Amino acid sequence: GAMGMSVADFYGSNVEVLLNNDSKARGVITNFDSSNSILQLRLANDSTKSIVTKDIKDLRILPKNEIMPKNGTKSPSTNSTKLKSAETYSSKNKWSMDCDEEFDFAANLEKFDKKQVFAEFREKD
């Protein structure tokens, strides 16, 4: 059905847009200017880019979450390689204090990061 919406709802929402050259990009909106129509998109990969809306060829909004259970006939809400059956629900309230999203939970004491580390620091021992 149709519902009333506000400009603040679009700000900070995650949408994807194709530019005039048929390239696609997605992220969460971080700024919008009515004087020159300029939009900054910040995506959950810690990357942000400022793009003027006039080069928007096409716009879409990605599903943040699914309200109903997944039967299988419908397509996946997001693009991923493999899903773990042990993991399914995240963030009991809304989000986590550490980072923007929680991933690689593992068993804490065992398998901290697939037995591999990029930076060295050793918090203890």
UniProtKB/Swiss-Prot annotation:
It is found in: Cytoplasm, P-body. The lineage of its organism: Eukaryota, Fungi, Dikarya, Ascomycota, Taphrinomycotina. Residues 91-125 form the DFDF domain. Transmembrane segments: none annotated. Residues 5-65 form the Sm domain. Homodimer. Interacts with dcp2. Belongs to the EDC3 family. The chain holds residues 1 to 121 of 454 of the full protein. This is Enhancer of mRNA-decapping protein 3. It comes from Schizosaccharomyces pombe (strain 972 / ATCC 24843) (Fission yeast).
